[PDB]
Amino acid sequence: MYSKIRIVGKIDVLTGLHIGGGAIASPVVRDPYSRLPIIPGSSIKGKMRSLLAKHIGDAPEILRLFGSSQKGAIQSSRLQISDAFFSKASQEEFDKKDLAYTETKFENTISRLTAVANPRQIERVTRGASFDFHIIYNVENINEVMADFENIKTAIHLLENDYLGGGGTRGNGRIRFVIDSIDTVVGDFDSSNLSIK
Amino acid sequence: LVVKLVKLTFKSPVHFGMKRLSDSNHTIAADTLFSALIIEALQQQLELSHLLNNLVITDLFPYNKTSYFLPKPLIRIEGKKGDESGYKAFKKLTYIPVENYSEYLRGEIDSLEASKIAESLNLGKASLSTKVSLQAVDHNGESEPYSVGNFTFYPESGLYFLAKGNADTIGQLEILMHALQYSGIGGKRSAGYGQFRCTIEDSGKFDSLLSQTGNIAILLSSAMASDEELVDCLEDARYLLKKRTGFVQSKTYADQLVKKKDFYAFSAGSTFYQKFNGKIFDVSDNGRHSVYRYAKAFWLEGKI
Amino acid sequence: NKKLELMYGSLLHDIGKIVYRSNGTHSKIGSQFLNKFKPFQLSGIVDSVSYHHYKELLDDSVAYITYIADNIASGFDKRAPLASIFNVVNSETKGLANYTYSFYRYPTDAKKEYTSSQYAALVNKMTDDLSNKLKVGPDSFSSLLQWTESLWSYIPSSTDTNQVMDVSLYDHSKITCAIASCIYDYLTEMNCVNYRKELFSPYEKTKQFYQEDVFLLVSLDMSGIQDFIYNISGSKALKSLRSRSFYLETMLESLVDDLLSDLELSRANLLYTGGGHAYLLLPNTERARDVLASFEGEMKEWFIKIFKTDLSVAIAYKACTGEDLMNSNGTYSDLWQTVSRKLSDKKAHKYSLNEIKLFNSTIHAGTQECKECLRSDIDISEDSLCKICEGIIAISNDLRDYSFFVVSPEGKVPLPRNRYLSVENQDGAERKIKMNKETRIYSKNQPFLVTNLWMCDYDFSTLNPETKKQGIASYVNREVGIPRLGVLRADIDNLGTTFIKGIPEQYRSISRTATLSRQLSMFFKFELSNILKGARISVIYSGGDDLFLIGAWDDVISKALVLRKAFTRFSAGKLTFSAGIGMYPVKYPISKMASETGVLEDLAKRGEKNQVALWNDSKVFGWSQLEEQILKEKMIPLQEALTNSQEHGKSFLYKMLELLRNEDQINIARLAYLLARSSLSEELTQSIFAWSQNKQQKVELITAIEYLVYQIRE
Ligand SMILES: Nc1ncnc2c1ncn2[C@@H]1O[C@H](COP(=O)(O)NP(=O)(O)OP(=O)(O)O)[C@@H](O)[C@H]1O
Ligand SMILES: Nc1ncnc2c1ncn2[C@@H]1O[C@H](COP(=O)(O)NP(=O)(O)OP(=O)(O)O)[C@@H](O)[C@H]1O
Ligand SMILES: [Mg+2]
Ligand SMILES: [Mg+2]
């Protein structure tokens, strides 16, 4: 009937990740309670949608995956990408070595006229960190599961070759996906053959 | 009719909206939960008869490490001889622990005790995450920021509610809640909010109170009676009318997204001397399907 | 027009006291003074002025009513000044002060006397005004009341040094006039042809009339104000916030004015108005009760028609006797508490079954909805604006220029009894009143058919033409400092307990409560504009005991400290208020701004509840702690030291914040090394290290660092 596949895994920070959001110069988005760095699910969803739109090219498949509010063709979002929270194993590893979860990066901007360097501070998530990511795929149609999952594989490949937040053309936000499990939590659909990345 | 306690522990922050995308409410009424349950039943192609005929549920109430919180009764409370501002404490009180519920009905809760109860709630932190929309940038435009008001619960806090019905209704609700863990409740479920895990069990601590008899009845859910019951159930009542609004979340209701008809329901905690049995009203305006608004009454009897 | 004569003779019964203080008894002097003016030579007025005491006092004249009203209201050094009302307020805990007013005015505690030359000047002014400007008539009593308010507010009502001279002449005269009107209505309802036998001939009849339930204490409260004003959307919400607040204020004033016009009473019976609340003193006649019932029904119907459940008005009245107003049996505060409890009971059961059934009887869905307040049951024009919403938008750009508010058959924003409020100047108000009768005009803070309302209308953007186009958004326009808006929510603590129990039982009376209420209302609705002078601040509301300000964040905190100092000066230390200050970006949701600042204020209202919350829940400080221990002790030295730095110390302050947030001893060593490498004053490094070492001083240090960082930013 209706099925939901749970894709849990880890996002490993290859290079310092800055997703904007006391007084800190360009702070990163954090969990309000634990004050831990997070990767908002909206960020991942938007980045994968943009990468898949670049790849395919809105297109119908993007509407099936990330949902559409267009008049007439109201499409439900098949992908629910939850916020990626700072991993507990990464938390223990960073508590060891006396390493902070976030680093401060200092950058210059050399003017094209006066050759004067304006400094700028940003905050990033340290390269050793990992985030527990959780995604739910809704099987609204059984015939498009393979197409949806190959589109997700293409988006994940593009994301692994892209950044996730901040200015990644200047060496920020590189990430890697490790898929711990892909198991059908709702319904009878067989997701054993399915794979991402 | 067997009462089942459903406890919901939330993984990600939740966006419970009142009127805006920036609103960060910590709870939802029985209307939102029942609409989510109906959507889940339609997704799983189950029958809607048990939900629409024999399920009585309460609002989503807070719970923390120490106690479960019930809505504050709208009872006439007496203060000290000259403590006029102390009444404001009872005005700011929203939830009372079950153990301290009866004491509140008997009038043995002072203003300082009410303030202690109000500050003793440890549900969580409400925040406002600022996001952006870069879709117009690719069309020679500008980014459009917006705000989502979320609420993150403390590690041992969450939202509980009580369900009443026969065995078949209870089991169907178990399947519906199991699917709702992964569907999510609230606002941006597809954008990383509302994910939770729920446990359904028996509630002796609540069966002690639900077996209590008294002279007054307290609403545990946002309810309203039909005209015939409203004729005689409104005498000596102390209630609070809430305007239930919103858009219809459905892919087949119409072409574009439209709002549903305005509804008005009594709040949780409203005290009546006559127990009225609500119903499931229709807030649909000539749509493809009938949009349901659950306003049945889950009652808690007490002595004033 | 015997009622009009009684009103004139009760508002001017003690007019001879000023002349007596200007060098027989004050009644003869008042009669002689009023006999100099032809319009005031009416028999009732003169009889009330010169016969209102037992020794001095047609068997049906209004002199008996004036005498008994003066006795009820009241309960010799001519130079004696006016003592501040807060001398006895909370005196059972904070002692009795000796603050007095000098001839807005602040009590200064110093020893002073009223010279007879000042009284001569007042007498000359009264003589000039009674001839050149004032006249008698049914519609001319409001101007007389406003003139009395403008002149006698700071003259003591009684100069006897045996008791406390808290009540001024204006308050005593207004209370006497209100009580006289109520007693006249009561006697007319009971068909009492003879007043001397009913009230005066034996003292037993006087005491028995003191036993009789003659008055009604009426409380009228609005519900839904916060959601109406602040739960709005759109980018133009900041340009309509003050308009919505002013609309609610004027609707409350129109409510009380219709209520008073129903009973043929003046505004002297309006004991208090403000903050969506109103206390009135009506007669206990059957006509009064039917009027109250009809008014409640019609206003409930109008509010359901126009706003449905968005706004509502609850009215609750309690019967009262003369000894209740005089606190002769210690049953004065019980009356007010019972009235408040009846009001809360009314607010509990708000609607009838028919009203709820019609609420749920909806035929068509919301379809289009307004940008602001997200309302859809009302018709929505183009640009997605509701009728009330676009009327409020039209009210602005007229509220910032014109100072007259006209309630007439034609206007912008609807008002009950099929009226409309618009904003015009003198010419517009004159035209509006001449085209159609039953048109009412209000003036804004104008010194003396116009009813003067005291409102806080201080807007900094309106002072400069270029910033007038962008009202509140111009406060984020700055050269240095973070472009943020500060929101200040202030609220007096335990005001209800101050009224009920703060005044000692020996001093509890209707005049004392009226004087205290008038002083608080004058402080909020008039003095806030004077206090906030020269600041980038807009007052959304100021009345009752609450206060809502939106401006530049630094200006907001500085003026919050100034307001705390001025409030301490005004209340003689007997009253304290708590505050919440939030700092938000421009384009931040205004509803979120209001809700979070209210959360901060409620955080400050805990325990001692004399605190200010700053930007979050972890910065709840005291007033002296924030002013001195945070700004005058930590922020100023660090700012002066870091101004010398080339980068202003932004990065070094960021490192200090990073080191301070953590709680490790090795990180204290890192902080010591950073302070050593700061290249600033060694005593300052020692002070900073000591402050970071001490708890409750590390929070202040962090707050000072963050304030300095915000000050030096872009
Ligand atoms: N014209 C106004 N504009 C803005 N704020 C106002 C205005 N008038 C009053 N206020 C403030 O707005 C609040 C009114 O909010 P509410 O309408 O909610 N009255 P509240 O006592 O808090 O609860 P109810 O028992 O009346 O339902 C007052 O308490 C003041 O804080
Ligand atoms: N000038 C005034 N005269 C008479 N009553 C007033 C005046 N200003 C405000 N009020 C009333 O004062 C009350 C203030 O109520 P609040 O809701 O502000 N609570 P309060 O008694 O001040 O103690 P706190 O919890 O704030 O520490 C309002 O409900 C109004 O009815
Ligand atoms: Mg107060
Ligand atoms: Mg207040």
PDB file of C-alpha atoms in Angstrom, chain C residues 343-497:
ATOM      1  CA  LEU C 343     -15.256  41.739  35.604  1.00  0.00           C
ATOM      2  CA  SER C 344     -13.161  38.566  35.390  1.00  0.00           C
ATOM      3  CA  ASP C 345     -16.323  36.459  35.674  1.00  0.00           C
ATOM      4  CA  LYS C 346     -17.827  38.477  32.813  1.00  0.00           C
ATOM      5  CA  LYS C 347     -14.671  37.918  30.755  1.00  0.00           C
ATOM      6  CA  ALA C 348     -14.926  34.174  31.451  1.00  0.00           C
ATOM      7  CA  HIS C 349     -18.430  33.628  30.019  1.00  0.00           C
ATOM      8  CA  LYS C 350     -18.166  36.087  27.142  1.00  0.00           C
ATOM      9  CA  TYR C 351     -20.746  35.018  24.530  1.00  0.00           C
ATOM     10  CA  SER C 352     -24.267  33.610  24.486  1.00  0.00           C
ATOM     11  CA  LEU C 353     -25.371  30.432  22.715  1.00  0.00           C
ATOM     12  CA  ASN C 354     -26.855  32.368  19.784  1.00  0.00           C
ATOM     13  CA  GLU C 355     -23.623  34.314  19.266  1.00  0.00           C
ATOM     14  CA  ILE C 356     -21.537  31.123  19.185  1.00  0.00           C
ATOM     15  CA  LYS C 357     -24.009  29.433  16.829  1.00  0.00           C
ATOM     16  CA  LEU C 358     -23.804  32.415  14.466  1.00  0.00           C
ATOM     17  CA  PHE C 359     -20.010  32.296  14.815  1.00  0.00           C
ATOM     18  CA  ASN C 360     -20.001  28.704  13.553  1.00  0.00           C
ATOM     19  CA  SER C 361     -22.582  29.469  10.818  1.00  0.00           C
ATOM     20  CA  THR C 362     -20.119  30.147   8.006  1.00  0.00           C
ATOM     21  CA  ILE C 363     -21.289  29.836   4.401  1.00  0.00           C
ATOM     22  CA  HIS C 364     -18.193  30.643   2.314  1.00  0.00           C
ATOM     23  CA  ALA C 365     -14.541  29.844   2.968  1.00  0.00           C
ATOM     24  CA  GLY C 366     -11.800  32.387   3.568  1.00  0.00           C
ATOM     25  CA  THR C 367     -10.669  32.599  -0.091  1.00  0.00           C
ATOM     26  CA  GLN C 368      -8.703  35.885  -0.258  1.00  0.00           C
ATOM     27  CA  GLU C 369      -7.230  37.161   3.003  1.00  0.00           C
ATOM     28  CA  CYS C 370      -5.606  40.389   4.131  1.00  0.00           C
ATOM     29  CA  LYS C 371      -1.836  40.762   4.309  1.00  0.00           C
ATOM     30  CA  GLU C 372      -2.099  42.187   7.829  1.00  0.00           C
ATOM     31  CA  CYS C 373      -3.915  40.303  10.632  1.00  0.00           C
ATOM     32  CA  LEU C 374      -4.625  37.528   8.087  1.00  0.00           C
ATOM     33  CA  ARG C 375      -8.388  38.056   8.213  1.00  0.00           C
ATOM     34  CA  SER C 376     -10.626  36.508   5.564  1.00  0.00           C
ATOM     35  CA  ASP C 377     -14.241  36.592   6.804  1.00  0.00           C
ATOM     36  CA  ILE C 378     -14.274  40.348   6.026  1.00  0.00           C
ATOM     37  CA  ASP C 379     -14.347  41.452   2.324  1.00  0.00           C
ATOM     38  CA  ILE C 380     -10.802  41.917   0.875  1.00  0.00           C
ATOM     39  CA  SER C 381     -10.189  44.697  -1.703  1.00  0.00           C
ATOM     40  CA  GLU C 382      -7.224  44.906  -4.065  1.00  0.00           C
ATOM     41  CA  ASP C 383      -3.674  44.854  -2.648  1.00  0.00           C
ATOM     42  CA  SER C 384      -5.073  42.278  -0.166  1.00  0.00           C
ATOM     43  CA  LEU C 385      -6.184  44.736   2.515  1.00  0.00           C
ATOM     44  CA  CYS C 386      -9.238  44.468   4.751  1.00  0.00           C
ATOM     45  CA  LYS C 387     -11.521  47.449   5.350  1.00  0.00           C
ATOM     46  CA  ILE C 388     -10.298  48.067   8.908  1.00  0.00           C
ATOM     47  CA  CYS C 389      -6.726  47.462   7.747  1.00  0.00           C
ATOM     48  CA  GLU C 390      -6.817  49.963   4.876  1.00  0.00           C
ATOM     49  CA  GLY C 391      -8.682  52.441   7.075  1.00  0.00           C
ATOM     50  CA  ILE C 392      -5.896  52.171   9.648  1.00  0.00           C
ATOM     51  CA  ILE C 393      -3.302  52.618   6.891  1.00  0.00           C
ATOM     52  CA  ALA C 394      -5.171  55.747   5.786  1.00  0.00           C
ATOM     53  CA  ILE C 395      -5.235  56.959   9.405  1.00  0.00           C
ATOM     54  CA  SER C 396      -1.445  57.124   9.342  1.00  0.00           C
ATOM     55  CA  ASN C 397       0.126  59.938   7.292  1.00  0.00           C
ATOM     56  CA  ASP C 398      -2.695  61.880   8.964  1.00  0.00           C
ATOM     57  CA  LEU C 399      -2.008  60.962  12.596  1.00  0.00           C
ATOM     58  CA  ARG C 400       1.609  62.143  12.297  1.00  0.00           C
ATOM     59  CA  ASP C 401       0.478  65.577  11.033  1.00  0.00           C
ATOM     60  CA  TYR C 402      -3.043  66.420  12.237  1.00  0.00           C
ATOM     61  CA  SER C 403      -3.844  66.645  15.946  1.00  0.00           C
ATOM     62  CA  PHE C 404      -7.668  66.486  15.919  1.00  0.00           C
ATOM     63  CA  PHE C 405      -9.605  63.207  15.956  1.00  0.00           C
ATOM     64  CA  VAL C 406     -13.167  63.489  14.642  1.00  0.00           C
ATOM     65  CA  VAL C 407     -15.828  60.880  15.396  1.00  0.00           C
ATOM     66  CA  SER C 408     -18.556  61.673  12.867  1.00  0.00           C
ATOM     67  CA  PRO C 409     -20.929  59.936  10.404  1.00  0.00           C
ATOM     68  CA  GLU C 410     -18.121  60.029   7.798  1.00  0.00           C
ATOM     69  CA  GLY C 411     -14.523  59.006   8.397  1.00  0.00           C
ATOM     70  CA  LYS C 412     -11.861  56.334   8.000  1.00  0.00           C
ATOM     71  CA  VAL C 413     -12.016  53.699  10.772  1.00  0.00           C
ATOM     72  CA  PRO C 414     -15.447  52.522  11.987  1.00  0.00           C
ATOM     73  CA  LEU C 415     -16.654  53.187  15.531  1.00  0.00           C
ATOM     74  CA  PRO C 416     -19.833  51.995  17.277  1.00  0.00           C
ATOM     75  CA  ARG C 417     -23.251  53.573  16.742  1.00  0.00           C
ATOM     76  CA  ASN C 418     -22.497  53.761  13.005  1.00  0.00           C
ATOM     77  CA  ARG C 419     -19.788  56.388  13.429  1.00  0.00           C
ATOM     78  CA  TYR C 420     -16.305  56.762  11.976  1.00  0.00           C
ATOM     79  CA  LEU C 421     -12.991  58.143  13.215  1.00  0.00           C
ATOM     80  CA  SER C 422     -10.868  60.392  11.000  1.00  0.00           C
ATOM     81  CA  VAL C 423      -7.890  62.677  11.640  1.00  0.00           C
ATOM     82  CA  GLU C 424      -8.070  66.367  10.717  1.00  0.00           C
ATOM     83  CA  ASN C 425      -6.807  69.798  11.738  1.00  0.00           C
ATOM     84  CA  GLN C 426      -8.867  72.668  13.170  1.00  0.00           C
ATOM     85  CA  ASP C 427     -10.478  73.488   9.811  1.00  0.00           C
ATOM     86  CA  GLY C 428     -11.375  69.852   9.178  1.00  0.00           C
ATOM     87  CA  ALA C 429     -12.861  69.402  12.648  1.00  0.00           C
ATOM     88  CA  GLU C 430     -14.864  72.625  12.302  1.00  0.00           C
ATOM     89  CA  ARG C 431     -16.236  71.528   8.925  1.00  0.00           C
ATOM     90  CA  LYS C 432     -17.046  68.056  10.271  1.00  0.00           C
ATOM     91  CA  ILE C 433     -18.938  69.435  13.266  1.00  0.00           C
ATOM     92  CA  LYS C 434     -20.791  71.969  11.098  1.00  0.00           C
ATOM     93  CA  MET C 435     -21.940  69.540   8.382  1.00  0.00           C
ATOM     94  CA  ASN C 436     -23.490  66.991  10.762  1.00  0.00           C
ATOM     95  CA  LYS C 437     -24.481  67.338  14.406  1.00  0.00           C
ATOM     96  CA  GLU C 438     -23.664  64.722  17.052  1.00  0.00           C
ATOM     97  CA  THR C 439     -20.061  64.918  15.823  1.00  0.00           C
ATOM     98  CA  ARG C 440     -17.382  64.723  18.505  1.00  0.00           C
ATOM     99  CA  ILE C 441     -13.860  66.163  18.366  1.00  0.00           C
ATOM    100  CA  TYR C 442     -10.876  65.091  20.469  1.00  0.00           C
ATOM    101  CA  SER C 443      -7.671  67.103  20.792  1.00  0.00           C
ATOM    102  CA  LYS C 444      -4.229  65.643  21.472  1.00  0.00           C
ATOM    103  CA  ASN C 445      -2.326  67.131  24.433  1.00  0.00           C
ATOM    104  CA  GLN C 446      -3.746  70.568  23.696  1.00  0.00           C
ATOM    105  CA  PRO C 447      -3.780  72.995  26.648  1.00  0.00           C
ATOM    106  CA  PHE C 448      -7.052  74.718  27.465  1.00  0.00           C
ATOM    107  CA  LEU C 449     -17.030  71.056  22.094  1.00  0.00           C
ATOM    108  CA  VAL C 450     -13.512  69.583  22.097  1.00  0.00           C
ATOM    109  CA  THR C 451     -12.532  66.847  24.567  1.00  0.00           C
ATOM    110  CA  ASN C 452      -8.802  66.856  25.309  1.00  0.00           C
ATOM    111  CA  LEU C 453      -7.207  63.396  25.458  1.00  0.00           C
ATOM    112  CA  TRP C 454      -3.741  62.822  26.900  1.00  0.00           C
ATOM    113  CA  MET C 455      -1.774  60.536  24.575  1.00  0.00           C
ATOM    114  CA  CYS C 456       1.917  59.760  24.143  1.00  0.00           C
ATOM    115  CA  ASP C 457       2.530  60.585  20.476  1.00  0.00           C
ATOM    116  CA  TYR C 458       6.316  60.940  20.513  1.00  0.00           C
ATOM    117  CA  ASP C 459       7.767  59.885  17.153  1.00  0.00           C
ATOM    118  CA  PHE C 460      11.332  60.845  16.274  1.00  0.00           C
ATOM    119  CA  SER C 461      11.035  60.289  12.512  1.00  0.00           C
ATOM    120  CA  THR C 462       8.269  62.899  12.210  1.00  0.00           C
ATOM    121  CA  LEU C 463      10.692  65.580  13.439  1.00  0.00           C
ATOM    122  CA  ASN C 464      12.786  65.358  10.253  1.00  0.00           C
ATOM    123  CA  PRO C 465      11.225  65.418   6.760  1.00  0.00           C
ATOM    124  CA  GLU C 466      13.558  62.892   5.110  1.00  0.00           C
ATOM    125  CA  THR C 467      13.156  60.297   7.879  1.00  0.00           C
ATOM    126  CA  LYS C 468       9.392  60.908   7.968  1.00  0.00           C
ATOM    127  CA  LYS C 469       8.855  58.728   4.884  1.00  0.00           C
ATOM    128  CA  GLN C 470      10.460  55.686   6.559  1.00  0.00           C
ATOM    129  CA  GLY C 471       8.936  55.759  10.032  1.00  0.00           C
ATOM    130  CA  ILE C 472      10.624  53.124  12.188  1.00  0.00           C
ATOM    131  CA  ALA C 473      12.901  51.714   9.487  1.00  0.00           C
ATOM    132  CA  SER C 474      14.999  54.904   9.687  1.00  0.00           C
ATOM    133  CA  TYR C 475      16.282  54.018  13.173  1.00  0.00           C
ATOM    134  CA  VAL C 476      18.458  51.237  11.720  1.00  0.00           C
ATOM    135  CA  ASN C 477      20.093  53.791   9.400  1.00  0.00           C
ATOM    136  CA  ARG C 478      23.341  54.623  11.190  1.00  0.00           C
ATOM    137  CA  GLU C 479      27.026  55.164  10.486  1.00  0.00           C
ATOM    138  CA  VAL C 480      28.440  53.063  13.343  1.00  0.00           C
ATOM    139  CA  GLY C 481      26.827  50.347  15.404  1.00  0.00           C
ATOM    140  CA  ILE C 482      24.798  47.317  14.390  1.00  0.00           C
ATOM    141  CA  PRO C 483      21.610  48.313  12.504  1.00  0.00           C
ATOM    142  CA  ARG C 484      19.115  46.887  14.999  1.00  0.00           C
ATOM    143  CA  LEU C 485      15.809  47.944  16.532  1.00  0.00           C
ATOM    144  CA  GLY C 486      15.311  47.821  20.288  1.00  0.00           C
ATOM    145  CA  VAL C 487      11.887  47.018  21.726  1.00  0.00           C
ATOM    146  CA  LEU C 488      11.190  48.077  25.317  1.00  0.00           C
ATOM    147  CA  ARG C 489       8.229  46.673  27.266  1.00  0.00           C
ATOM    148  CA  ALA C 490       7.819  48.238  30.713  1.00  0.00           C
ATOM    149  CA  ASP C 491       5.218  47.435  33.361  1.00  0.00           C
ATOM    150  CA  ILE C 492       4.636  48.654  36.922  1.00  0.00           C
ATOM    151  CA  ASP C 493       4.839  45.962  39.598  1.00  0.00           C
ATOM    152  CA  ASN C 494       1.972  45.171  41.976  1.00  0.00           C
ATOM    153  CA  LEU C 495      -0.125  48.179  40.967  1.00  0.00           C
ATOM    154  CA  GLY C 496      -3.315  46.309  41.847  1.00  0.00           C
ATOM    155  CA  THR C 497      -1.970  45.484  45.302  1.00  0.00           C
TER     156      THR C 497
END
